[PDB]
Amino acid sequence: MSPSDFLDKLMGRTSGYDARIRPNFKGPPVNVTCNIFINSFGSIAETTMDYRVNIFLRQKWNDPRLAYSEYPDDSLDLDPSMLDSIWKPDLFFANEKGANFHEVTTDNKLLRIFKNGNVLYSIRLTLTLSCPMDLKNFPMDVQTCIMQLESFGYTMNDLIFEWQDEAPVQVAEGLTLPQFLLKEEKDLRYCTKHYNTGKFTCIEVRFHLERQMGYYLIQMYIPSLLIVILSWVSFWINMDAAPARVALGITTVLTMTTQSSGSRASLPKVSYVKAIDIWMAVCLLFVFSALLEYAAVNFVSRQHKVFIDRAKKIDTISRACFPLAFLIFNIFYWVIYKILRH
Amino acid sequence: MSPSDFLDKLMGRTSGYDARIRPNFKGPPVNVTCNIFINSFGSIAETTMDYRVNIFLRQKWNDPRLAYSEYPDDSLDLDPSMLDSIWKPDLFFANEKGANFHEVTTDNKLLRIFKNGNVLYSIRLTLTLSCPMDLKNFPMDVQTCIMQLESFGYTMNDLIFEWQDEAPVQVAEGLTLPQFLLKEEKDLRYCTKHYNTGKFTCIEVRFHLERQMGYYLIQMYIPSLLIVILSWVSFWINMDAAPARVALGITTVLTMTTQSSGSRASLPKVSYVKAIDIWMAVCLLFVFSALLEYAAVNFVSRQHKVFIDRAKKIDTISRACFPLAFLIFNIFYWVIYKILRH
Amino acid sequence: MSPSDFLDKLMGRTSGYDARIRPNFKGPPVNVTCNIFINSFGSIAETTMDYRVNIFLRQKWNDPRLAYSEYPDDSLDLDPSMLDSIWKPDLFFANEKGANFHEVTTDNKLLRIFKNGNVLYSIRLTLTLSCPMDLKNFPMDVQTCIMQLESFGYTMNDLIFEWQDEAPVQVAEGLTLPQFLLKEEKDLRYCTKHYNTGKFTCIEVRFHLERQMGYYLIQMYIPSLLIVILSWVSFWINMDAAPARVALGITTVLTMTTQSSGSRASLPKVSYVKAIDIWMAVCLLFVFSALLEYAAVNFVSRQHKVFIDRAKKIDTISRACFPLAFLIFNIFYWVIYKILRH
Amino acid sequence: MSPSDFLDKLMGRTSGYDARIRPNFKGPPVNVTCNIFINSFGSIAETTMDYRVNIFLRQKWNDPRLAYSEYPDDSLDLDPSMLDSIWKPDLFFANEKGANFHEVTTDNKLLRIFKNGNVLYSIRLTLTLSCPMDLKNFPMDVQTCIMQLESFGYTMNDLIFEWQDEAPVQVAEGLTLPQFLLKEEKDLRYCTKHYNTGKFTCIEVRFHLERQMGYYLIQMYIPSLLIVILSWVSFWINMDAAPARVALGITTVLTMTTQSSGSRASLPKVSYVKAIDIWMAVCLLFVFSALLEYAAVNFVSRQHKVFIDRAKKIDTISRACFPLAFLIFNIFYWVIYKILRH
Amino acid sequence: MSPSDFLDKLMGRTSGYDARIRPNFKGPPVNVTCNIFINSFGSIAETTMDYRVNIFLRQKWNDPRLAYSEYPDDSLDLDPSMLDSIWKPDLFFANEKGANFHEVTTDNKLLRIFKNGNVLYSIRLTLTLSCPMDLKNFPMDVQTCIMQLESFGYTMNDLIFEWQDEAPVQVAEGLTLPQFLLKEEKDLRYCTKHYNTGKFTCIEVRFHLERQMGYYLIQMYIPSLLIVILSWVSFWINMDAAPARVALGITTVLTMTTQSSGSRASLPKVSYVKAIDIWMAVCLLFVFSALLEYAAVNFVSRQHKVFIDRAKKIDTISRACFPLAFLIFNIFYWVIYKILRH
Ligand SMILES: *[C@@H]1O[C@H](CO)[C@@H](O[C@@H]2O[C@H](CO)[C@@H](O)[C@H](O)[C@H]2NC(C)=O)[C@H](O)[C@H]1NC(C)=O
Ligand SMILES: *[C@@H]1O[C@H](CO)[C@@H](O[C@@H]2O[C@H](CO)[C@@H](O)[C@H](O)[C@H]2NC(C)=O)[C@H](O)[C@H]1NC(C)=O
Ligand SMILES: *[C@@H]1O[C@H](CO)[C@@H](O[C@@H]2O[C@H](CO)[C@@H](O)[C@H](O)[C@H]2NC(C)=O)[C@H](O)[C@H]1NC(C)=O
Ligand SMILES: *[C@@H]1O[C@H](CO)[C@@H](O[C@@H]2O[C@H](CO)[C@@H](O)[C@H](O)[C@H]2NC(C)=O)[C@H](O)[C@H]1NC(C)=O
Ligand SMILES: *[C@@H]1O[C@H](CO)[C@@H](O[C@@H]2O[C@H](CO)[C@@H](O)[C@H](O)[C@H]2NC(C)=O)[C@H](O)[C@H]1NC(C)=O
Asked: Who contacts E278 (Cβ-Cβ below 8 Å, separation ≥6)?
C-alpha cells in the first residue's frame, strides 16, 4: 500500500495519537534505555572548568500506540521532519553550560519504529560540560569527567532512564586526545535528583582521563632542573668575583620566580598547593640557599688565615652537598608522587 | 475520560481562556511566589564585572480560570509545547547582560496545574549578571552579588513578585567555587523600581562571596616577600663591590615594579588604592630604600678613617633595621586588614 | 464587556486596521517622541572603538485608528505577543555594530494605549555602539559618545523623530563606571541624514565621559617617576665603577623602553602623539641623557689633574641639574595638560 | 481608494504575481543596478586576514508585473514585512566569512515601487570580508580590499549585476580609520565566475587603504634607533672595563632580538621578508657587529705597545664608522622604500 | 503554459509527491554523486586542532518522481524557497565542530531539475573541521586534513554517497594560504561507518598541506643561531674578567630557555618531542656547555704556570671545537630532517 498514507494513518489526527501524552499515561513508568557514541572528545580547559564533547545520543523506548502489524516491514526508518509530532523524552544534561544541535545540511536526527512499538531515536549533540577538577597532584593527576542525563519535567513515577546492557558508551576508533589518555573502562552509576518539585530520574557516566607528563617535563621540570644546575655552577667560581657570583645568583632566583609564576598561567585560581607548586617552591628554596651560601662565604672571607680556609671549606662541602640534597629530594618526590596516585 | 480532550476543554477556544489576560483582570494583583535552585555558579570575572549562573527558576501563581474538579488527579503535569497558550508572568532580570534558555534535547520547562488553579512553572536559565564590585581590600574582600527579578510590563497594581516562605534560594549539593566560598545565608530584600512609566514589582536576592587568599599568597605575597629578603641580602655583601650591590638593587627594584604591574593584570582599571597595591608600594619603597642606603654608603665611603667606620655602621644598623621595620609593617598590615573586614 | 472581544474589535480583520499603513497615511508626518533609560553602561574598549549600553527605549506616538471611547479605562496595558499586529516606527541605530533584544523569560516589551490613541512602546535593548575617540590628551581626556536614532525606511515627509521635553535621557540610580565619570548633562541635537534615497529623520544624544587618572598614575606615571629617580641614583655612585654605572644606565633605559612599549598595549594603533607618549619620550630622553652624561664623564676621566676635577664637576652639576630640569618639565607638563582640557 | 486593497490587488493571489518567477521569465536577463553606502569601516585584522564593514546595499531592477497606473502616487514606499512576497535577486558576497542582517527594532529594510515597475530595495548589512594581503613592504604598504557581489543561483542568461552610473560607492561623511587612510577613488571591475554549473554574474569593487607610519615609528623604528645608539655608546667606554662593555653589548643584542620577535606579534605567519624584518635584521647585525668589535679589541689588547695603539685605533675608527654606515643604510633604506610604492 | 502551474503540478498535493519518501523507496539505493568547490581555505589553528573552510557542496541524484516531458526546457532552475518541499539527502560532516549556512541576502542555495529527473543541489557552507595533527617534525611537516561526508539517518541499503568522476574537488583560482601550500592532488577514499544502528555511507577526501619554513627560520631558528654565536663570543674574552664571562653565559642560557619556552606558545600540549624541541634542546646544551667550559677554565686557573697554559689551551681548543661541533650537528640535523619527510 501507499507509504504516504501509512505515515498519517499510524499516527496523527486520524488515529488520535497525541504527542503530549506518555506511552503509558496511567500505569507503569516508561523505561528509556540510553547509549552514547563519542564522535570527538577534547577542548578540556582547566581555566573554564569544562570540556567539549560531540556525541550521538540514542534513546530506545516502547510506545504501544506506534505498534503496527499490517505493514510487512519489521523495522522502518522515518524522516526527521515528523519528529515534532511524536512523543520524545525530555532528556537534558545537568552539568552542561552550553549545547546545540547540528543542522549542517539537514537535521542530524534518526528515528526507527519497530513492529512491536519500539522507538529508536538517535541525535547528534555538541556539549560543553562542566567538570569539577581536583587540581592537587596537578601534573600527575587523573581527572574524572561526569555526564548526567536527567528528566527535567517527568517524575520517577512517570519516566525512568536506564543504561543499555550491551555497549552503553562506545568511542570512535582512533579518537585520541593531545593532553590525556581516556581509559577503556567507563563507570556507570545511578544519580537521582531530589528537589522540592519531586524525584527525577538520572543516569551518570564518568570518564577517567590521565594527563601525560611529556609536555610538563619539557616545559616546566627540565628548565627548572637546568636553573638549579645553573645555581650549582656558582660553587665552582672563585671567591673574590663578587659581581659574577651575585649576578648569577640574582638572575637564577629571578628566573626561578618567573617560572614559578608562569607555571600557573593556564590554570584557575585554586588555593591549595599542587605538585608543580611544591616543585617550584623547593627549586626556589635551593637557588635562594645557594645565594645565601655565597653571602655567608663573602661575609666570612672579609672578617680579617682561618677565615679563608673556613670559607673555602664551605664551598667545598657545598659542591657535594647541594646536588646530593637535591638528588634526595628528587628521589623522595618522584616516589611519593608515583605511589599516592593508585 | 480521554486525556487529549481535557487539554483543550480546560483551556483554549472552546473554554474561552485567553493567554493575554491576567488571572484576575479587574481586581487584586496576581501574587507570584518565586524560588531558585542554583545548578552551577562560577565564571566570576572582575574585568567584565559579571558572573555566570545556571538556575532553575520556579514561579507559583493562582489562576482561577485553570481550576478543574472533574478530573480525579489532584495535581497534573503538562508538556512544555503548550506553554505558549497559557498566561505566564513577564519576569526579567534587571542586571543581566546576556541570557538564554536551554533546548538541549527539548525545552527545559516544567508546568504543573493543581485542582484549585495553582500553577507551578519551572524553567532552566543561564544568566550573565553584572556585579558592581568594591575592589578595595582586594585580596581580603567579601563581594556581594545581586539578582533582581522584575516585571517589565505589569505595574504593581497588576502583578506582585514575592519570595517563597520556605526555601527561597537553594543551592546544588557539592557546588564549590575555585576562587570563592559562597556563604550559607542569602539576603532577600524588596527592591522596587520607579520609572516615568509606573511602579514595577521587584524582588532582590544577594549572595556573599569570600575570596580565598591561597592563590594570592602563592602568586603575589610570597614572591614579593622573597624579593624584599633578596634586597636584604645586599647588606651582607662587602662595601667595595659596587657592581654586585648596584646590580642586585637594580634587579630587585625592576622585578618589584614588574610584579606591581602584573598584580593588576586581571583587574579592571579602577582608580582607588587596594590592599595589594599598598603592599606592592611598600615593598617597592623598601627595595628602593635599600638601594638608596647603598648609595649613601658608597657616597660616604669615598669622602677621603671615620668615614669607613661610619659607613660600616650604616650597614650594621641597616642589617637589623630593615627586617625589623618590615616586620612591624607586616604585623600592622595583617592586623588592620584582618580587623576592618568584619 | 469581555476583554477578549475588545482586543480584536478595536483592531484586526473586523475593524480593518492595517499594520503596514501609517497612522496618517496621506497628511502630516507622524511625530514620535523618544526617551531612554540607561540600565547599565560600560565595556568601553578603546581598541575596538565601541561601548556597550543597555537601555529601555520608549517611543510615544499618536495613532488615531487605535482610539477608543466605549471602554471605561483611560489607559490600558497590552501583551507583547500582539505587537506584531500594530504599526511601529522603524527606528534603528546608525552607529551600532551589534545589538539584540532580550527574551530572558518573555519578550521584554511594553505597550500602552490611551483613550485618545496615544501609543507608548517601551523595549529593552543591548547596544554595541561605535565611538570615534580622539586619543590625544589620552590620560587626561574627555570622550564624547554619541547615539543616533534614525528611521531606515520612512522619509521626513512621513515620519519625524523628536526628543521628549521632560526627561529625555535618564540614568539608573547608582550606575557607576570603573574607568569614567558620566556627566550629569547630556547634549541633544538634531542629526539629519541625506542620502540619494531621501531625507531621513534622526535624533542624536551625546554623552561626555571623563577618564580617571588614578589607574594611570599607579600603572604608568609613578613607575616611570621611579625609573627616572633610579637613573638619578647613578650620579651618587663613584666614577671608577664602570660596570655598576653602565649596568644601571642600561637597565634603566631598557625598562623605560619596555614601559613605553607597554603603555600602548590596550590602545588602537593611532598615529598621533598622546600625553602618555610625550611623558614616556621625555622620561626616556632623561634616562638616556643620564647614561650619556656618564659616558662623557668616563671619556673625560681617562684623557691623561684638571680632567679629574672637571669630570667630578660634571657629576656635581648633574646632581642638582637633572632633578631641577625634571621638576621644571613636570610643572610645565601638568600645567599645560590641566589647562587645555577646558 | 483604500490603501489596504491596493497592496493585495497589485500583487498576490488575486493578481497572480509569483515571487518564484523572474520579471522576464523567458526573455532578456533582468538587469540589477547596485550601489553601496559605507556606514562604517574598520576592524582590519591582519592575523585573521579580514575586515568588517557596515553597508547599505541598494538594488534597483525593473519588474513589469509590479507596474501600476491607477494609483496617483508616482513612487510609493512599502513595509518590510511584505518583502517575503516579492521577487528579489539572490545576491551574495563571494569573499565573506560571516554576515548578518540588523533587526535592532524592526527589519532594516526599504522597498520602493515606481509607476513603471522600477523596484528599489535597500538593506543594511554587516560583512566580515576576507582580504588577501601582500605583507611585503609591511609598514609602508597600500592594501587592496575587494568586495564581490555575485548571483548564487541565476546564470548570466537570467540575471546580470551592474554598477550604478552615478555614485556607485559612497562613504559616510567623517568616516575615518585609526590605522589607514581610505582613498577617494574606488575601482570598479567586472568579475565573472565560471564553474561547472554555469556562468554567474559578478561585480567587484576594490578599495585602496594606505597604512600610516606614525604608530610604527613610535613603536618599532624609534626604539630600535635608540637601541642602535645605545650600542654606539659602547665605543666611548674605556677598554679595560670588560663587564661594562660586554654587559652593554649583551643587553643590546637581547633587547634587539626581543624587539624583532615582538614586531611580528600581531601578524600572520607569512614566510617572506618584510620591510620591518629587514630593518630589524640590519639593526641586529649592527649591534652584533658592535659586540664583535669589542671582542676584537679585547682580543688584540691582551696579545702581549703597538697592540694598545692598534686596539685604540679600532675604537677611534669605529666611533666615526658605525654612525656613518648606519646613516648610509638609513638613507638608502628610506629612499628605496619611498620609491617602490608608486 | 503558465510557469506558476507547473511548479505545483509537477510536485505537491496535486501530484502526490512526498518529500519524506526516497526516490526509489523499495528497490535499489539512491546514488548521490557529490563534488565540492573550495571558495576559501585557512584559519588552521594547531591549538584548537581544527581548520575553517568555505565550500560549495553539489549533490546530484536521480528522482524519477520529478521527471517531466511536457515542458520544453531540458533543464530548469528553481527558487530556494521550495527546497523544503523536495526530498534531499541527509548529508552531514563527521568531523565538524561547528557549521552554518549563509543567508546574507537570500538563501545561498541552487536547485536544478533535468528532464529525466536528475536533481542538482548546490549549497554554500562554512565548516570548522577537526584535524588530527601529527606534530612530530613540526616545522618540516606535511599535514593531512580530512573531510568525511556521511548519511546520518539512511543505511547503505537506502542511500549511497559517491564522488563525481570528473572534478571531484575543485579549488578557487588564486586561493593561497599564509602558512601552507595546498597540494594539487587530493586523495579520495571510501570511509564507511559501522555502528550498532547500522551501516552508513561515507565518502572521505583528504588534503595535503606543507608548512613553509620562512616564518620559523625568521622567528625561531636564526635567533637561536645568533644566541649560539653569542655564546661563542665568550671564548675570545680574557680569562680574568669573571663578571663579563659569567654574565654573558647566564644571559645566553636564560634567553635560550625563554626562546625554548616561547617556541611552543601557539601549540597544543603534546607530549612527544618535535624537531623544534630537539633544536632548542641542543642549542641550550651548547650554551650550557659553553658556560660549563668557562667554569672549568676558572676552576683550573685558580689552582695555584702549567695551570695557566692548560686553561688557555682549553679556550684555544674550544674556539675551534664549538663551531665545528655545531656545524656537524647542523649538517646532520638538516640532512635527517630533509630525508625522512619523503
Ligand atoms: C519499567 O521498568 C520497571 C522496572 O523494571 C517496571 O516495573 C515492574 O513491572 C513489572 C511488570 O508488571 C512488575 O511485575 C514489577 O513489580 C514492577 N517493578 C517495579 C519496581 O515497579 C515497569 O513495568 C516498566 N514499565 C514499562 C512500561 O514497561
Ligand atoms: C495578592 O496579595 C495581596 C497582599 O497579600 C492581596 O491583597 C489583600 O487582599 C486581602 C483579601 O481581600 C485584603 O483583605 C487586603 O486588604 C489586601 N491587601 C492589600 C494591601 O491590597 C491580594 O488580594 C492578593 N491577590 C490575589 C489574587 O490573591
Ligand atoms: C507633527 O509635527 C509637525 C510639526 O510640529 C506638525 O506640522 C505642523 O502642523 C500644524 C497643524 O496643522 C500646522 O499648523 C503647521 O504648519 C505644521 N508645521 C509644519 C512645519 O509642517 C504635524 O502636523 C505633526 N503631525 C501630526 C500627525 O500631529
Ligand atoms: C539587460 O541589459 C542587456 C544589455 O544592455 C539588454 O540586452 C540588450 O537588449 C536590447 C533591447 O532589445 C537589444 O537590442 C540588445 O541586442 C541586447 N544586448 C544583448 C547583449 O543582449 C537586455 O535587454 C536588458 N534586459 C532587460 C529586461 O531590460
Ligand atoms: C546505485 O548504484 C548501484 C551500484 O552501481 C546500483 O546497483 C546495481 O544496479 C544494477 C542495475 O540493476 C544491477 O545490475 C547491479 O547488480 C547492482 N549492483 C549492486 C551491487 O547492487 C543501483 O541500482 C543504483 N541505484 C539506482 C537507483 O540507480
From this structure: E333
